[PDB]
Amino acid sequence: AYPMPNPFPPFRIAGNLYYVGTDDLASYLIVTPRGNILINSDLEANVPMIKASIKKLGFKFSDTKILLISHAHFDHAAGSELIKQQTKAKYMVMDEDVSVILSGGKSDFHYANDSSTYFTQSTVDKVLHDGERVELGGTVLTAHLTPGHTRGCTTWTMKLKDHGKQYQAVIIGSIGVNPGYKLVDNITYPKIAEDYKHSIKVLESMRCDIFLGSHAGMFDLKNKYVLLSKGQNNPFVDPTGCKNYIEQKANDFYTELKKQETG
Ligand SMILES: [Zn+2]
Ligand SMILES: [Zn+2]
Numbered sequence: 690a691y692p693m694p695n696p697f698p699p700f701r702i703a704g705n706l707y708y709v710g711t712d713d714l715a716s717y718l719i720v721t722p723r724g725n726i727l728i729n730s731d732l733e734a735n736v737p738m739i740k741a742s743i744k745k746l747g748f749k750f751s752d753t754k755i756l757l758i759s760h761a762h763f764d765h766a767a768g769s770e771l772i773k774q775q776t777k778a779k780y781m782v783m784d785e786d787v788s789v790i791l792s793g794g795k796s797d798f799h800y801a802n803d804s805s806t807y808f809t810q811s812t813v814d815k816v817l818h819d820g821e822r823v824e825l826g827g828t829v830l831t832a833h834l835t836p837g838h839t840r841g842c843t844t845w846t847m848k849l850k851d852h853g854k855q856y857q858a859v860i861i862g863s864i865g866v867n868p869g870y871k872l873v874d875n876i877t878y879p880k881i882a883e884d885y886k887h888s889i890k891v892l893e894s895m896r897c898d899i900f901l902g903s904h905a906g907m908f909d910l911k912n913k914y915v916l917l918s919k920g921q922n923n924p925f926v927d928p929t930g931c932k933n934y935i936e937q938k939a940n941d942f943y944t945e946l947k948k949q950e951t952g
Contacts, residue, residue, distance in 0.1 A: 690805070691732070691763070691764055692713070693732070693734060694711035694712055694713040694714050694731070694732070694735060694738075695711060695712040695713075696711060696712070696738050696741075696742075697710060697711050697712045697742075697905070697910070697914075698745075698914070699718075699742035699743070699745050699746050700746075700914065700917065701746075702717075702849075702858070702899065702901070702925050703849040703850075703851040703856060703858065703899055703923060703925060703926070704848075704849030704850050704851055704856075704858075705719055705720045705721065705828060705849070706718075706719055706847065706849055706858060706899075707719075707720065707746055707748075708742075708910070709727070709739055709742035709743050709746070710729065710731070710735075710739070710742070710905065711731065711735055711738060711905070712905060712910075712911070713904060713905050713906065714729065714731040714732065714735060714764055714765065714903075714904065714905075715729060715860075715901065715902060715903055715904055715905050715907075715910065716728060716729040716730070716731055716735075716739055716742075717729065717845075717860060717901070718742075718743055718746070718748065719825070719828055719830065719847070720748060721825045721826025721827065721828045722826045722827070723754070723825055723826030723827075724752045724753070724754035724755075724825060724826065725743075725748060725752045725753050725754060725755075725825075726753075726754065726755045726756075726757060726823065726825055726828070726830065727739070727743075727753050727755070727756050727757070727772065727778065728756075728757045728758065728759065728845060728860065729757075729758055729759055729765045729766075729903065730756060730758065730765070730766055730767065730768030730769040730771070730772045731764065731765065731767070731768050732763070732764065732767050732768060733767055733768050733771060733808075733809070735768055736768040736771045736772060736775070739768070739772075740775070750775065750776060751776060753772065753776040753778045754778060754779065754825060755778055755779050755781060755823060755825060756769060756772055756773065756776075756778040756779065756780045756781070757781055757782075757823065757830070757832075757843070757845065758782060758786075758843070759842070759843060759844075759845070759860065759862040759863065759902075759903035760786060760838060760839040760841065760842035760843060760862045760863055760903065761782065761786035761789035761790050761794075761797075761839050761840075761841060762797075762800075762806070762839065763794060763806050763807070763808040765903055766790060766808060767808035767809065769790070769809070769811045770809040770810070770811040771809075773811060779814040779815065780811060780812070780813055780814050780815075781813070781814060781815040781816075781817050781823060782813045782816065782817060782841065783816075783817045783818070783819075783832060783834060783841035783842075783843045784816050784817065784818055784841060785834070785836060785839075785840035785841030786839050786840055786841025786842070786843075787813050787816055787841070789839065789840075789841075790810075790811055790813055791810060791811070791812070791813065792810065793807050793808045793809055793810040793811075794806050794807040794808055795807060797839075798840060798875070798877040798878035798881070799867065799869070799870060799877070799878075801877075817832045817843070818832070818834075819832070819833065819834035820832070820833065820834075828847065829847065829848075830845055830846065830847045831845070831846045831847070832845065833845070833846060833891060833895075835861075835862055835864060835887075835888040835891055835892060836884035836885075836887065836888060837864060837866075837881055837882075837884040837885030837887075837888050837942075838862065838863040838864055838865055838866070838867070838885075838888075839862075839863075840878065840884070842862040842863055842864075842888070843862045844859060844860065844861050844862045844891070844892065844895075845859075845860040845862070846858065846859050846860070846895075849899060851899075851923055851926070852922075852923070856898035856899045856926060857895075857896045857897060857898045857899065858898065858899035858901060859895060859896075859897045859898075859899065859900060859901060859931065860901040860902060860903070861892070861900075861901065861902040861903070861907060861908075861934070861935070862902075862903055863902070863903050863904075864885060864888045864889065864892065864935075864938045864939070864942065865938060865941070866885070866941065866942055866945045870945075871949070872885075872945060872946050872949050872950075873946075873949050873950060882946060885942050886942075889935075889939040889942065892935045892939070893935060893936075893939065895935075897928055897931035897932065897935070898926055898928050898931075899923075899925050899926055899927070900925070900927040900928070900930050900931035900934065901925070902934075907934060908925075908927070908930065908931075908934070909927075909930065913925055913927070
């Protein structure tokens with residue numbers, strides 16, 4: 690079973706972007722004069738945690754206007770229907786992943802036949818496309834299609850001001866190859882390897898100042914948070930870590946491809 694995450698203190702990352710996630714499954718709140726955007730609904734058990742985190746920061750759960758995800762797997766999206774029911778947020782999902790959301794996982798190219806991965810079916814209020822923007826209260830997020838891990842995996846970017854300086858924030862959706870994924874002659878998702886290679890090209894040339902991800906462990910949330918509490922100059926500003934992480938996962942993809950092609 691997926692290891693149930695533990696709660697994590699919420700905090701401001703930079704500018705109007707806040708962490709409201711767990712010690713593992715990462716969720717983000719963007720606060721604007723015209724309401725808030727939430728990214729990743731996580732497990733159903735995490736929806737009360739997300740609500741508690743938002744409120745702890747002094748914001749209103751009922752001000753959640755838009756719900757986004759990193760990608761269509763249960764650990765980022767299972768909680769979406771609950772959040773819709775509780776806030777009436779508008780759910781926006783990259784086109785290639787919509788079928789998985791509508792079907793609660795039953796159409797998943799890999800996990801269609803694994804009932805332990807299914808989640809509550811939800812409707813998508815706006816279908817997104819590569820490079821499409823999500824705009825609220827003057828804040829502008831950009832959806833980047835970085836496919837492979839899912840057909841519609843989305844890397845979310847925005848610009849944040851912090852201490853009079855400008856930073857590109859990048860929430861890497863995932864370019865991990867899950868155990869069991871078939872990269873050669875995939876029957877359901879033939880372009881899976883071409884899609885990962887595209888994601889690598891995009892991410893390797895993407896400006897990345899504030900380094901984030903769909904899972905805390907991607908970007909060293911725990912140790913960085915400890916530095917933040919100690920008052921350090923924004924430890925979430927980590928371009929080197931971001932470049933090193935993208936390089937590592939690009940190499941991991943080619944390591945797994947080699948294994949499947951020659952092992
Ligand atoms: Zn996933
Ligand atoms: Zn995940």
